[PDB]
Amino acid sequence: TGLLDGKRILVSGIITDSSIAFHIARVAQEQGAQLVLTGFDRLRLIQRITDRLPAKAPLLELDVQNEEHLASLAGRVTEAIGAGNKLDGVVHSIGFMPQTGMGINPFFDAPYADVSKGIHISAYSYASMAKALLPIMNPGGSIVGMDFDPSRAMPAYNWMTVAKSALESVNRFVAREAGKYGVRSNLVAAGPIRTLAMSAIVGGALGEEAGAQIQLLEEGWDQRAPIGWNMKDATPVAKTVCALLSDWLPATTGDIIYADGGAHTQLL
Amino acid sequence: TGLLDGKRILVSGIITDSSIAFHIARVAQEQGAQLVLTGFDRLRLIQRITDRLPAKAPLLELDVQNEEHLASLAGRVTEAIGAGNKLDGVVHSIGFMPQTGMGINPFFDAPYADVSKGIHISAYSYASMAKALLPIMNPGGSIVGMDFDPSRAMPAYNWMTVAKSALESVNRFVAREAGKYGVRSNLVAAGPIRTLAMSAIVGGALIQLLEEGWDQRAPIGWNMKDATPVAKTVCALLSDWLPATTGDIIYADGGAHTQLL
Amino acid sequence: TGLLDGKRILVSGIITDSSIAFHIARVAQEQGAQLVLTGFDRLRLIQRITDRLPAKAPLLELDVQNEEHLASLAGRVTEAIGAGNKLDGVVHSIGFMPQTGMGINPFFDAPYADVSKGIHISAYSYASMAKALLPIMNPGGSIVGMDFDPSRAMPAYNWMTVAKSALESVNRFVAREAGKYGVRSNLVAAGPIRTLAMSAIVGGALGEEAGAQIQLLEEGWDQRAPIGWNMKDATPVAKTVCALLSDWLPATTGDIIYADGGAHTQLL
Amino acid sequence: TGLLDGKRILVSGIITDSSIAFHIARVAQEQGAQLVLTGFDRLRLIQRITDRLPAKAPLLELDVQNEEHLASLAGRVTEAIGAGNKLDGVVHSIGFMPQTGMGINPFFDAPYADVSKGIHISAYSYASMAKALLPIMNPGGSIVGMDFDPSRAMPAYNWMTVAKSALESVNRFVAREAGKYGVRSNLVAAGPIRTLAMSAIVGGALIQLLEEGWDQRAPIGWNMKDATPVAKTVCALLSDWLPATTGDIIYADGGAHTQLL
Ligand SMILES: NC(=O)c1ccc[n+]([C@@H]2O[C@H](COP(=O)([O-])OP(=O)(O)OC[C@H]3O[C@@H](n4cnc5c(N)ncnc54)[C@H](O)[C@@H]3O)[C@@H](O)[C@H]2O)c1
Ligand SMILES: NC(=O)c1ccc[n+]([C@@H]2O[C@H](COP(=O)([O-])OP(=O)(O)OC[C@H]3O[C@@H](n4cnc5c(N)ncnc54)[C@H](O)[C@@H]3O)[C@@H](O)[C@H]2O)c1
Ligand SMILES: NC(=O)c1ccc[n+]([C@@H]2O[C@H](COP(=O)([O-])OP(=O)(O)OC[C@H]3O[C@@H](n4cnc5c(N)ncnc54)[C@H](O)[C@@H]3O)[C@@H](O)[C@H]2O)c1
Ligand SMILES: NC(=O)c1ccc[n+]([C@@H]2O[C@H](COP(=O)([O-])OP(=O)(O)OC[C@H]3O[C@@H](n4cnc5c(N)ncnc54)[C@H](O)[C@@H]3O)[C@@H](O)[C@H]2O)c1
């Protein structure tokens, strides 16, 4: 009776109740999904946060840079959902980039070690998770990652833009591997959403003027989006992710769905 | 239980039970929609076809090159669904290109009158239907058209490739208009499907090699005789589950377009 | 010494001295090219215009909607350049769209008859000219058309945007035909240039604050463009066309070169 | 007379006389450029290769993973062309990916340490060199890097494809910076060319079929054994004849990427 009814889905990337992952988790559960959650580093906090989700779901630790976490991942998921059950869905909502690689910090000044950390967490880990989880996914399954359209450069996004371009390429190759399991792999390219990560970043760049520029970003995005855009609401993005986790897009893989109000299809 | 529960949706393009529009209509009815169908030219023939759909639905004549048909359409639709009710969905699943514009016929030999007719039916008509039906569409509604990825030239598709390129551009402008009504506009780029147009327009102007090639490039495979995955994709767009996508193209092609070999 | 030394190039599209084609013609001549020119309708006026070019050049009438003009073109060109001589280059710098298909006139209110004529002249005729001239082109030859990037919708450009999308598609097919002859076919996507088509034709469709809307277009373009953009200067565009007419892009065909200051590569 | 007469141009990436950089260098010199060359690893062996060039040019050492090399680059480059002289061109023609990231080795088995090294050398180093060399570039100058179209996935190319996607994105940011110096930044996406990297990196990770399919898809054909058309394109970008193109990608692939089949 729900869009994701009877589906077991892993969701990564909850850190705050504003996280896009949190809303993906909320909407999936509203649509009848049974979730496993993964969290990085602050697991007591994430536990308290996810108490506020509609239903109780098991939380597993996963630092995508930790090889041991990746190697034990499938075993721990299987334990969490019960032996014999497989995942129908996997959500990658994970991103990171050192401040040097962001903002008004000069593009040329980011040291490779910083960039490389960012790309490891933001792009490579999409292949890492897929590698760890594909052997426990059902045919008809769906892996989804979060994207921010990096086809053109822009202020501030800097090296994360580069990491997303890498992510887009990784996704196309994940699809080749995933297809062997009858599993789809796609990205959702979202417009700007007022998550705490989003606001910290622009705030890290512009400081005292960050609040104003954020309101201006919202105005510009809403104007260019033919159906408009609400930065305060992650629901449309979360629904798009759930659509890809459902069986209603069975012939789409290696691809990118734009949940950005249609802004990227307009010049002005 | 139903992805499109309660929605009122107009579906154009049904001519046989292999039509992508037929499968779109079937699946939508299965998912709780109520349809109004439109047919070009063969009304008695289409009526027999549509009698095979899981539920009966009113059938309206529509020639997209006929100005009077377009002018009467909204009123005719309202008459069929009852005053005070509006559409939630519109499906544009039509196209045509004269033989000279297709297959092994030389690209340079297609006369403009031929090309022009093809573009009228396959691309302009998307704006035309939108112009006619937007005044009777509900907020949150959705207009969906059928595309075949024309970003790179290819044998056989010739001038229809040009018509599809125009359509994609048209779709982005319809989205600006449709947005004023709170309505989305998108295309589904489908992989090759065994339809009347496939056999009679394309094949008539010349396929097994095409199925194999497409199935190879597609990471999850491709079945030319199964329009259902395409139909489901259109339904996804007609649903409330892709509420932030407009002016866009969704690829229901097995992932073929994301792979070089 | 000259980039196009010894080459024989047909240039269409000159109507005023602000025409992109006029500057393409000037620079080509400065680079040692020998030219044949084509003009539509106002041929006395055009001839007065072309007298201001650095060098003499035959002027032939060509209305791309006139089948008879198209059928006699090769013969009139060959008569102009001498028998046993062929063209090395062809420039299509031709566009048209009735006022109804542009500006603040509603997108839905443009009749297909208006749009169709616009597509005939702006898109289909690229195939027409190629059909007429390919039999009189040397291997190593080059056909170039003028584009305005239509991959995203925008205010005002309206149905001309659709024509340009059609033209891009046509160019990919012309490339397959031209290939047999060892001839390249490409488009130059220029940024906005203050020709009279811009200021008067598009400008006239813009309503009351037309000038301001066009200046705003320039400011936005200059800003997005990493090297900036000057709407008053067609020379970077004319040079780019000449680059495609030269032997220095011998492996590029069916393609688009962006002479737009790099604006299309930047979101903001 | 020469396309690049009096232009001072740095060219990285020569390792054998099949290198794309070697042919870029050869064509630039034929067109009157004064070159400075950089090499990695076996510089004495590279010197033997660079001696085969038309004119003798200074060879400097540059490992792009070496912060000292990068920090001293401009100083050493200035020493080579003379104090008071600046560069007009910079050619980035380098890249690398460990075997684990290539060919028949499973995509999922490449350790990040390996991928990272490949991304560092192949993509980040484009920004690295720009940062080092922009302060000694004249207005009107041109930075060019080599690309292989990564917009779709493909067998064998694997993680290098990902590095190329990074590079394309890096190029767009390098353009923003280079613009402040009146300098252009672009990539050339080349078709397949028989080089040491083609043979040792890609080939050992596994060939003739690649050439045929590319030549078939290219409207003007394509020759894997001929790097000259690619070198010419790079020189076009180094010249004054593409002065309005930046942050972009020019395809020197025989038009292959514009055709489905
Ligand atoms: N907020 C937006 O506007 C926006 C727009 C488009 C795309 N995105 C993408 O959506 C996803 C989530 O972003 P968000 O806006 O919700 O911010 P967020 O801070 O809520 O989510 C980012 C997540 O990455 C996790 N993470 C960081 N390092 C990790 C590691 N080593 N191992 C495992 N997890 C790690 C964090 O703990 C966090 O949960 C990202 O991929 C982001 O780039 C965000
Ligand atoms: N079969 C495929 O492989 C495939 C792949 C991608 C996209 N498409 C697209 O899907 C849509 C439907 O095509 P199909 O494959 O189902 O073939 P089809 O023959 O089953 O449907 C084509 C329809 O166009 C309608 N039509 C033609 N002229 C008309 C007019 N003047 N006014 C109103 N309607 C008119 C026909 O009556 C018919 O029902 C088209 O837009 C087509 O290009 C088909
Ligand atoms: N001005 C810009 O900003 C700009 C930007 C990108 C692309 N373009 C393109 O460049 C080309 C030239 O436009 P322009 O800006 O130089 O304005 P323009 O008016 O000087 O050039 C347009 C030309 O088309 C010719 N033409 C119209 N109908 C014709 C027909 N039936 N047969 C033969 N010729 C015909 C006109 O006579 C004229 O010479 C067009 O294709 C246009 O779309 C212009
Ligand atoms: N050969 C092809 O088919 C082809 C096609 C398209 C694009 N490309 C690209 O063109 C460029 C040249 O490659 P190629 O085909 O000529 O092979 P190549 O082997 O002749 O050149 C590759 C170069 O990378 C250099 N390099 C590796 N690590 C380095 C480091 N740490 N610091 C500085 N330089 C380093 C090598 O020493 C070498 O000279 C590359 O970026 C490549 O990816 C090659």
Sign, CA dihedral A131-A133-A139-A144, equals negative
Does residue D217 contact residue D256 with C-beta atoms inside 8 Å?
yes
| Count of CB atoms situated within 10 Å of the CB of B170 | 29
The answer to whether residue D251 neighbours chain A at the CB level (below 8 Å) is: no
Q: Tokens 């993906």: give the residue.
A: A24
The secondary structure of B203-217 as a DSSP string is GGG--HHHHHHHHHH
Most distant pair of Cα atoms in chain C: their distance = 55
Cα–Cα distance measured from residue C86 to residue C72, given in angstroms and rounded to the nearest whole number = 15
- CA–centroid distance, residue C238 to ligand 3 (Å): 14
What are the distances in angstroms from CA D139 to CA C68, C227, D142, D243?
50, 10, 9, 11
Please return the burial class of B143, using the count of CB atoms within 10 Å of its CB with bins 0-12, 13-18 and 19+.
Answer: buried
Cα–Cα distance measured from residue C232 to residue A204, given in angstroms and rounded to the nearest whole number = 39
Does residue D20 contact residue D45 with C-beta atoms inside 8 Å?
no
Question: C89 phi and psi, to 5 degrees?
Answer: -145, 150
- Judging contacts by C-beta atoms under 8 Å, the chain C residues touching residue D248 are 258, 262, 264-265
Q: Containing H/E element for A210?
A: helix A210-224
Neighbours of chain C (3+ CB pairs under 8 A): A, B, D
The answer to whether residue D47 neighbours chain B at the CB level (below 8 Å) is: no
The secondary structure of B30-64 as a DSSP string is HTT-EEEEEE-S-HHHHHHHHTTSSS---EEE--T
Does residue A45 contact residue A52 with C-beta atoms inside 8 Å?
no
Instruction: Specify the pairing of strand B87-92 against strand B34-39.
Output: unpaired
- CA–centroid distance, residue D80 to ligand 1 (Å): 47
Please return the burial class of B25, using the count of CB atoms within 10 Å of its CB with bins 0-12, 13-18 and 19+.
Answer: buried
Cα–Cα distance measured from residue D119 to residue A112, given in angstroms and rounded to the nearest whole number = 10
Cα–Cα distance measured from residue D160 to residue D202, given in angstroms and rounded to the nearest whole number = 10
Question: C141 phi and psi, to 5 degrees?
Answer: -65, 170
Cα–Cα distance measured from residue A232 to residue B261, given in angstroms and rounded to the nearest whole number = 41
Cα–Cα distance measured from residue A164 to residue C71, given in angstroms and rounded to the nearest whole number = 52
To probe the interface with A, which of C213, C221, C268 has the most A CB atoms within 10 Å? C268
Question: C5 phi and psi, to 5 degrees?
Answer: -45, 120
Residue type, D1: T
Most distant pair of Cα atoms in chain D: their distance = 53
Ligand 3 pocket residue status of C19, Cβ below 6 Å? yes
Q: Containing H/E element for C224?
A: helix C210-224
Structure tokens at C148: 């305005």
Question: D188 phi and psi, to 5 degrees?
Answer: -115, 110
The answer to whether residue B172 neighbours chain C at the CB level (below 8 Å) is: yes
The answer to whether residue A99 neighbours chain C at the CB level (below 8 Å) is: no
Among B1, B2, B62, smallest CA distance to B28 is for: B2
What are the distances in angstroms from CA D51 to CA C255, D6, D22, D48, D194?
36, 21, 11, 5, 21
Please provide the distance, in angstroms rounded to a whole number, between the alpha carbons at the two ends of chain D: 40
For residue D70, which ligand has an atom nearest its CA?
4
Q: Which residues pair with B142 in a beta bridge?
A: B89, B184
Please indicate whether, in this complex, the C-beta atoms of A253 and B221 are within 8 angstroms of each other.
Answer: no
A100 secondary structure, DSSP code: G
> Which residue range forms the structural domain that includes residue D49?
1-261
Estimate to the nearest angstrom the gap between the alpha carbon of A18 and the chain centroid: 13
Q: Searching chain C, which residue's CA lies closest to the CA of residue A224?
A: C154
Cα–Cα distance measured from residue C26 to residue B44, given in angstroms and rounded to the nearest whole number = 63
Q: Which residues pair with D153 in a beta bridge?
A: B259
Structure tokens at A219: 């105005």
Instruction: Specify the pairing of strand A255-259 against strand B184-190.
Output: unpaired
Q: Containing H/E element for D252?
A: strand D248-252
Mutate to test the pocket of ligand 1, among A12, A20, A37, A117 (most ligand atoms within 8 A of CB): A20
Q: Which residues pair with C185 in a beta bridge?
A: C143
Sheet holding A255-259, edge to edge: A59-61, A34-39, A8-12, A87-92, A137-147, A184-190, A255-259
Q: Tokens 């290109």: give the residue.
A: B97
CA distance A33 to chain B (A): 15
SS3 of D153, please?
Answer: strand
Ligand 2 pocket residue status of B121, Cβ below 6 Å? yes
Helix spans in chain D (H): 20-30, 43-50, 67-81, 112-119, 125-133, 158-178, 196, 208-217, 228-238
Cα–Cα distance measured from residue B224 to residue A251, given in angstroms and rounded to the nearest whole number = 12
Residues near D78 by Cβ (< 8 Å), separated by ≥ 6?
D85, D136
Ligand 1 pocket residue status of A263, Cβ below 6 Å? no
For residue D93, the ligand 4 atom closest to its alpha carbon is: 11
Residues near A130 by Cβ (< 8 Å), separated by ≥ 6?
A90, A143, A174, A177, A178, A185, D108
Does residue D145 contact residue D187 with C-beta atoms inside 8 Å?
yes
Cα–Cα distance measured from residue A259 to residue C267, given in angstroms and rounded to the nearest whole number = 17
To probe the interface with C, which of A107, A216, A267 has the most C CB atoms within 10 Å? A267
Residue type, B252: A
SS3 of D59, please?
Answer: strand
Q: Resolution in A for the shown PDB structure? A: 2.4
Q: Tokens 């009777």: give the residue.
A: B136
- CA–centroid distance, residue B202 to ligand 2 (Å): 12
Structure tokens at C164: 């340009």
Among C166, C167, C223, C171, smallest CA distance to C192 is for: C223
Among A186, A193, A192, smallest CA distance to A90 is for: A186
Q: Which residues pair with D50 in a beta bridge?
A: none
Annotate D53-76 with b (16+ C-beta within 10 A) or e (fewer). beeebebbebbbeeeebbebbbee
Cα–Cα distance measured from residue A93 to residue A242, given in angstroms and rounded to the nearest whole number = 13
Angle subtended by helix axes D20-30 and D43-50, to nearest 10: 40
The answer to whether residue D116 neighbours chain C at the CB level (below 8 Å) is: no
Cα–Cα distance measured from residue A118 to residue C79, given in angstroms and rounded to the nearest whole number = 65
For residue D157, which ligand has an atom nearest its CA?
4
Q: Is C64 annotated as contributing to ligand binding?
A: yes
Q: Which of residues 129-148 of B touch C (CB under 8 A)?
A: 130-131
Angle at C226 between CA C224 and CA C230, to 5 degrees: 75
Please indicate whether, in this complex, the C-beta atoms of A162 and D150 are within 8 angstroms of each other.
Answer: no
Does residue A115 contact residue A102 with C-beta atoms inside 8 Å?
no
Angle at D169 between CA D166 and CA D175, to 5 degrees: 135
Please provide the distance, in angstroms rounded to a whole number, between the alpha carbons at the two ends of chain B: 39
Q: Tokens 């030269």: give the residue.
A: C246
What are the distances in angstroms from CA D121 to CA C213, C264, D62, D65, D143?
45, 27, 11, 7, 17
CA distance C181 to chain D (A): 9
Does residue C153 contact residue B176 with C-beta atoms inside 8 Å?
yes
Instruction: Specify the pairing of strand A8-12 against strand C184-190.
Output: unpaired
Structure tokens at D21: 């950089």
The answer to whether residue B221 neighbours chain A at the CB level (below 8 Å) is: yes
Cα–Cα distance measured from residue D148 to residue D251, given in angstroms and rounded to the nearest whole number = 9
Q: Is C19 annotated as contributing to ligand binding?
A: yes
The secondary structure of C124-162 as a DSSP string is IHHHHHHHHHGGGEEEEEEEEEEE---SSB-TBTHHHHH
For residue D66, the ligand 4 atom closest to its alpha carbon is: 31
Please indicate whether, in this complex, the C-beta atoms of A154 and C265 are within 8 angstroms of each other.
Answer: no
Ligand 4 pocket residue status of D93, Cβ below 6 Å? yes
Cα–Cα distance measured from residue A177 to residue D109, given in angstroms and rounded to the nearest whole number = 12
| Count of CB atoms situated within 10 Å of the CB of B234 | 33
Cα–Cα distance measured from residue A238 to residue A74, given in angstroms and rounded to the nearest whole number = 25
Q: Which of C153, C220, C265 sits opposite A266 (nearest CB)?
A: C153
The secondary structure of A101-162, three-state, reads HCECCCHHHCCHHHHHHHHHHHHHHHHHHHHHHHHHEEEEEEEEEEECCCCCECCECHHHHH
Cα–Cα distance measured from residue C235 to residue B220, given in angstroms and rounded to the nearest whole number = 49
Ligand 1 pocket residue status of A121, Cβ below 6 Å? yes
Supply the Cα-derived Rg of chain B in whole angstroms.
17
Cα–Cα distance measured from residue B206 to residue C76, given in angstroms and rounded to the nearest whole number = 36
Please indicate whether, in this complex, the C-beta atoms of B248 and A266 are within 8 angstroms of each other.
Answer: no
SS3 of C198, please?
Answer: helix
Q: How many domains are contained in chain A? A: 1
Does residue D247 contact residue C266 with C-beta atoms inside 8 Å?
yes
CA distance B39 to chain C (A): 21
Q: Searching chain B, which residue's CA lies closest to the CA of residue C151?
A: B169
Among C257, C255, C205, C210, smallest CA distance to C100 is for: C205
Q: Containing H/E element for C48?
A: helix C43-50
CATH of the domain at A215: 3.40.50.720
